[PDB]
Design a binder for these strands. Structure first.
Ligand SMILES: COc1cc2c(cc1Cc1cccc(Cl)c1F)c(=O)c(C(=O)O)cn2[C@H](CO)C(C)C
Ligand SMILES: COc1cc2c(cc1Cc1cccc(Cl)c1F)c(=O)c(C(=O)O)cn2[C@H](CO)C(C)C
Ligand SMILES: [Mn+2]
Ligand SMILES: [Mn+2]
Ligand SMILES: [Mn+2]
Ligand SMILES: [Mn+2]
Ligand SMILES: [Mn+2]
Ligand SMILES: [Mn+2]
Ligand SMILES: [N+]
Ligand SMILES: [N+]
Ligand SMILES: [Zn+2]
Ligand SMILES: [Zn+2]
Lengths: 163, 365, 365, 163
DNA sequence: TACAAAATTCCATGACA
DNA sequence: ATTGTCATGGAATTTTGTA
DNA sequence: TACAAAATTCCATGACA
DNA sequence: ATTGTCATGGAATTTTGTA
């Protein structure tokens, strides 16, 4: 087969509910399957609507060939289904209860979770403002393979904020 | 005094003998090919020249032609030019007739995120309660982010850029000196993140040229997409942004997106040439492509350009000149020549101003 | 249909053999130096080209580069260019890249009063309750009359010109097409006196160039005379008028007044050369001087000028274009080429318009 | 001496009072001594002031070397005297009761008078509007010497309204 | 070792208020 | 410190498919 | 049958909103 | 029918006063 490349697959999931910051309760998480680059979008609901608005933002940058996700009501809906056919994105669903991703993605999707709780306790209703910092942080972390940052794999260059 | 000897027939340095210098009406006169003219004493000449010039504040030739009607003396023009140099009024109203030297073509930024150019477009027809678009162009790749705003304000800029820099943080942000970006709040925001703010010379969009040229495309596409329909731009910005980031520059043979990512996304007609290389082999090809891009050379100088020389007398254009008021400030001195197209001046007065040639005239005389 | 024979290996006019034309995914493919591309059937190509173009309404090269990613066929560009010719949107939004041909330098009017050029300046800062100056320039001599007015209106124009034409009546009055002069009341006033009204092409001040260039001087002198003082222009107009009428053109070597009168008035520095000739000998010298004046030739054409050809497709500039709307009207046809710089068009639609090249683009493709 | 030329002398006088046209009562008459070119200025009074305003108009065109006039209070005043010294115009006064001008000027100044009465009776309160026509008329009339119109002597060319 | 024509590169022109 | 830019479509040039 | 310098002519540049 | 114009001040050229 062809070697794996960025934009081939976007893994997406919801995190929440969280304590309200700026009237926001959930985080939609988009990780690129090949590079491990992460996008974070604050939403008010784990709904198709909140997803679509969020992903409209992301898809002004790049459009993936595939979005993979769990069978959450928000992703299985026909409105989301139509949205994806419009943009020419194939939809891929993990079987219920057996929610599998790439090895690298589990490992990534895990830090995000750790990192959220970490700077969520003692800073609870302030997390909306720190998303940018959280995001930058993840994307510039050295995955022990391939000794590159998501930032480096995506852009083919160093960052002006290293970690 | 010095005029007695001449009637006597003795030679005076600068008064060509062979012409008969007679006397009439108690004034000294000379018979010349052009006709018979009066020769006034030294102590009167400046008064004369000024009188003639003051009729309509005429330049060298026009002034002289008046004077020539009645008078002659050695080196008339020399004296005329002296006056035109000291006429406050003419100096600050008359336009230039010397053009700026050739523009410069600043080296393209090495890597993306080295430098962002930013500007606001608008006001536009109210769509969804928004009036302005913040435009952010990556210097290297040309990649552009668009953000709709209700005011061209620091608040809005900061809000928008907090989203953008969730992707990456730039070394430098170039902007014009509009209130939005010259505010202290912005500087502080930028300092918090280790971003250098760099400003265009006052009233000179060429400096923001990268972002300005992009505004044109943004507007031109919105326009075409809006033919026949009501001007509902808000919902189009994403489409426009995406469209333009994936448009080839016939010169570069690449889309901004390609230069940022080294591989197309899932968009219409997405290039597949690198489909066989591993991401790594792909990433170095891009690194190579980025360094070998076209780079425009600076054009030849026009016949009558001028260039700034330290200690030159120089005048700055009045920013927002009132009706019937002078289009130029009084003279200033070049303090440092930063590049052959930007200088520091001791203005009005005396403050240090970094300024463009295009907003300067060399004080004549 | 026409694609079976090719896989068979039989030659098709326009499909270079030597390249192997295989089959995959039920599409015909060719292996080319650039890579392996899909060859779509004739009945699909137009749909393809349009799809690619519609992404950002890109021109020839930019469109082709997209298409080239996935497809190949004979004479791709030919098809691209066909689409760009039929894209309503692009045709009426895209700017020109072909410049007007060389300007013309209309012969200077033979005698004074042959032709008057007129225009209004303003609004200016309220002086004495007045806001505008009516400027009237004699075509031949350059002599100028100034009249202060409260509105740029027919009423005022008529009032002012009734004074002026107590001196003499002109054959022709040239004006721009501002409401003041295009009104029926004015035409009637002019007809009563046997004066032909002649109008500039719409939105083109070059045609009023004689009067416009004079506005500059008028403004520039008022300006200089007003440095430091409050803008009290009303009381200055006479002074300005007089000043400027007695100013030499370094090129002609004459003042407008000299060209009108053949002898200076009692003004500062009044030329006395003809003091010895009888008025008659003076009057013929002037008649001779008037015919032998400098006359500027038309400049060379720029590399990429265009010129109007009867039956050409041509587009008129939108007068006062709204925000985000097309800067050009739909296409029209050249009906008559009046001179190489003025044409008659069948516009929108269909009315006859006399129009300048500078307000036209040749419809590309 | 030097041959006589236009602008050497401007003969000026008042005509009136006349029946009111547009609230105007008098005409100031300026004739150029050499050419016979005539200017007419409607005024509300035979006063220094009304003169000065009128002549300010005329002197934006050309300034004479000399103005000649009768000893009317309006011309002998010191305000007029100063006005003339400002513009560098010499003032010349005819002895009282013996009011002499150039031969050509009497002949001219006479037509003006005839022509006024002529188109003043039956058109009485309308004469302000006809001044332009009257003026043009005079300036384009052939003086039997020198078989030239004032217009022709001043401008060195024909008119677009001949008589 | 050479041709006509397609394909590519050149590049002035104008618009970012 | 700070600095003009680049899509566009005819024309001019170069390459291509065939000898 | 000639020189340096003054005097004149050339002419690109910009402004008439 | 309708159409660019011309003051300005350095530079380039021509003329001038003296051999
Ligand atoms: C010349 O008139 C302009 C003034 C402009 C802009 C543009 C133009 C025209 C032009 C536009 C774009 C690029 C180029 Cl190179 C160019 F020449 C802006 O774009 C802009 C901003 O705030 O972005 C602010 N200004 C202000 C005006 O009040 C001042 C800088 C005069
Ligand atoms: C190009 O912008 C201009 C538009 C002008 C004018 C001038 C200019 C600039 C310009 C001025 C003078 C001469 C030239 Cl040669 C020239 F290029 C007028 O002077 C004028 C009038 O009514 O007199 C009306 N317009 C209107 C604008 O609403 C239209 C004709 C666009
Ligand atoms: Mn979930
Ligand atoms: Mn701006
Ligand atoms: Mn701008
Ligand atoms: Mn006008
Ligand atoms: Mn105008
Ligand atoms: Mn009297
Ligand atoms: N640079
Ligand atoms: N002409
Ligand atoms: Zn001055
Ligand atoms: Zn189009």
């Amino acid at each position: 087969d062809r070697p794996q490349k960025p934009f081939d697959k976007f893994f997406i999931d919801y995190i929440g509910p969280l304590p309200p910051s700026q009237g926001y309760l959930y985080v939609l998480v988009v990780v690129d399957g090949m590079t491990g680059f992460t996008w974070l979008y604050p939403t008010k609901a784990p709904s198709t609507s909140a997803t679509v608005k969020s992903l409209n933002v992301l898809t002004s940058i790049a459009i993936p060939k595939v979005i993979h996700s769990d069978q959450g009501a928000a992703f299985t809906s026909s409105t989301f289904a139509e949205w994806a056919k419009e943009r020419g994105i194939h939809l891929e669903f993990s079987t219920p209860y057996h929610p599998q991703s790439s090895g690298k993605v589990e490992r990534k999707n895990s830090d995000i979770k750790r990192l959220l709780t970490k700077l969520l306790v003692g800073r609870p209703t302030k997390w909306y403002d720190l998303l940018p910092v959280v995001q930058l942080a993840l994307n510039n972390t050295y995955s022990p393979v391939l000794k590159y940052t998501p930032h480096q794999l995506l852009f083919g260059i160093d960052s002006n904020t290293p970690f | 005094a010095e005029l007695d000897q001449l009637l006597q027939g003795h030679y005076i340095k600068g008064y060509p003998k062979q012409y008969t210098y007679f006397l009439e009406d108690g004034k000294v006169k000379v018979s010349r090919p052009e006709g018979v003219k009066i020769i006034p004493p030294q102590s009167d000449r400046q008064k004369i020249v000024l009188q003639a010039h003051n009729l309509a504040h005429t330049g060298r030739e026009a002034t002289l032609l008046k004077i020539a009607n009645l008078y002659w003396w050695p080196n008339m023009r020399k004296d005329v030019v002296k006056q035109l140099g000291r006429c406050q009024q003419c100096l600050i109203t008359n336009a230039s007739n010397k053009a700026s030297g050739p523009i410069l073509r600043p080296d393209r930024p090495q890597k993306p995120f080295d430098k962002f150019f930013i500007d606001y477009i608008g006001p536009l027809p109210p769509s969804q309660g928004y009036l302005y678009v913040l435009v952010v162009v990556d210097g290297m790749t040309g990649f552009t982010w668009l953000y709709p705003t209700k005011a061209p304000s620091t608040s809005a800029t900061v809000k928008s850029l907090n989203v953008l820099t969730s992707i990456a943080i730039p070394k430098v942000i170039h902007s014009d000196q509009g209130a939005a970006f010259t505010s202290s709040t912005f500087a502080e925001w930028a300092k918090e993140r280790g971003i250098h703010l760099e400003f265009s010379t006052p009233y000179h969009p060429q400096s923001s040229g990268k972002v300005e040229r992009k505004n044109s495309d943004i507007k031109r596409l919105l326009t075409k997409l809006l033919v026949g329909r009501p001007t509902k731009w808000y919902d189009l910005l994403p489409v426009v942004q995406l469209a333009l980031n994936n448009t080839y520059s016939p010169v570069l043979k690449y889309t901004p997106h390609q230069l940022l990512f080294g591989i197309d996304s899932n968009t219409p007609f997405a290039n597949q040439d690198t489909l066989d290389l591993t991401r790594e082999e792909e990433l170095s090809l891009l690194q190579e492509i980025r360094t070998s891009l076209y780079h425009p050379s600076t054009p030849p100088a026009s016949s009558r350009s001028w260039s700034p020389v330290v200690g030159q007398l120089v005048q700055e254009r009045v920013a927002r000149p009132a009706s019937l008021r002078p289009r130029w400030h009084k003279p200033s001195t070049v303090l440092k020549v930063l590049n052959p197209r930007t200088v520091v001046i001791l203005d009005h007065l005396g403050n240090n101003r970094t300024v463009s040639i295009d907003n300067l005239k060399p004080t004549s005389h």
